[PDB]
């Protein structure tokens, strides 16, 4: 198989992404980042939970793949099959190297691309879940089952933003009241007071 994750744990090297120079990189084991009822509007899932990291380490694409399923599986039993929506907010882009041995030793030891990993900073969201507000403890347990699939420690925080928006939940409805936020399906378009005037006529009609 592959090496233990203790080996490629620290953000040791410069970011070495799959490019014109690093070719022949295997596909990342995580391919599906979003799942659940991702075709859901912004006004039925007000609650949003986070798994914010607390270390400057590298999370493998397999840990991202493994933790996704375990958080997905627990939310299926708890909140039905369509009572939530899960975003993995880390995309593995750093390529790790393997110095495969077959005797050469260390003469010309520039490794071959082994797999792909994801570098994460302190206080950065790893994986976030939107759902109905009454299923509060269901998510905070689901992310707890996801912490055991990652190295090191990370906190579980419930954001104050409405859904996956960047707008605070308390200010949300009053902005939808004065038509400051136009629901664009899974997201929402922020309308400023700066465009040409005719489109302001459009929204008010």
């Amino acid at each position: 198989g592959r090496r233990p994750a203790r080996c490629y744990r620290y953000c040791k090297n410069k970011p070495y992404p799959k490019s014109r120079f690093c070719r022949g990189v295997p596909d990342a084991k995580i391919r599906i980042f979003d799942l659940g009822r991702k075709k859901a509007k912004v006004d039925e899932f007000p609650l949003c939970g986070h798994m914010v990291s607390d270390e400057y380490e590298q999370l493998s694409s397999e840990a991202l793949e493994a933790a996704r399923i375990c958080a997905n599986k627990y939310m299926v039993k708890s909140c039905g099959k369509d009572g939530f929506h899960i975003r993995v907010r880390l995309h593995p882009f750093h390529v790790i190297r393997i110095n495969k041995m077959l005797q050469t030793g260390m003469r010309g030891a520039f490794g071959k691309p082994q797999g792909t990993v994801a570098r994460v900073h302190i206080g950065q969201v790893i994986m976030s879940i939107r759902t109905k507000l009454q299923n509060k403890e269901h998510v905070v347990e689901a992310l707890r089952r996801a912490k055991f699939k990652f190295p090191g420690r990370q906190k579980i925080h419930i954001s104050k933003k409405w859904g996956f928006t960047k707008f605070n939940a308390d200010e949300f409805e009053d902005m939808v009241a004065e038509k400051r936020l136009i629901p664009d399906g899974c997201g929402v378009k922020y309308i400023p007071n700066r465009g040409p005037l005719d489109k302001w006529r459009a929204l008010h009609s």
Binding site: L197, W200, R201, H204, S205
Partner: protein, 293 residues
Amino acid sequence: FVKVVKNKAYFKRYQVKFRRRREGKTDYYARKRLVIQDKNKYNTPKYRMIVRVTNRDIICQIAYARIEGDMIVCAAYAHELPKYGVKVGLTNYAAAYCTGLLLARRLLNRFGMDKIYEGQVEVTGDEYNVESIDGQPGAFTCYLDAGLARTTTGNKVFGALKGAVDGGLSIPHSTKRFPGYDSESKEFNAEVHRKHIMGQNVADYMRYLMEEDEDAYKKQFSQYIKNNVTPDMMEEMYKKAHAAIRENPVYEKKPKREVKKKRWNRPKMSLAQKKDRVAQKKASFLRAQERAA
């Protein structure tokens, strides 16, 4: 559909060219070679003869380059000619030779080099070059600034140039582009150039329209009949016009009369109006929205 070419990112990267290039008025590839001076000359000005042709005028200026904007030392126009002797036809080849003469004579009269450097009084149309005279002040030297005009043989930017070199300026040039240089056998013919300088090609057009058709003649040379310019007095008109320039080429500015201080233009709007036009516009939208409902 198609990917929108002029999108927001297209303007974010866009680098405009120079203003005088954005209007098609300056060839900076040619201007750089024209107006800059060699650095071991140190503010020795590089005078250039700016000859410009329009639809109804010819502008011949002389200028040297400066960092705050190149400075006009002396100018001349085509419409200064009806003061001397040229009633109509102020854009033909014979008009250019006058303006180049009027520019050259006015300049040396301003540098006190009128009594010296007479030039070519009797117009002939061959190679003339004013060699400097020892002891006396050296001859003035400048360069032609053609611009974006295609410099083919007989172009009127070379006509005014001829008027200048006969006036006494030592402009380096040659006879490949004058009206009368043979293209195929590669030699000059001074007699043919004399015709165009004295406007004879127009007379041979007007004499061509006597036996052919009067109606087109009464439409092609309308102001020529309004000023009675027959093909018999044309050579002796410019010949008289050349004398009347070489005796008093000074310019006399019109009196700057007191203006009444008004505004035809339209004044720009203040912010308080723009911010209130939309406040009226927004109010007038909703108050027209409650009527129909």
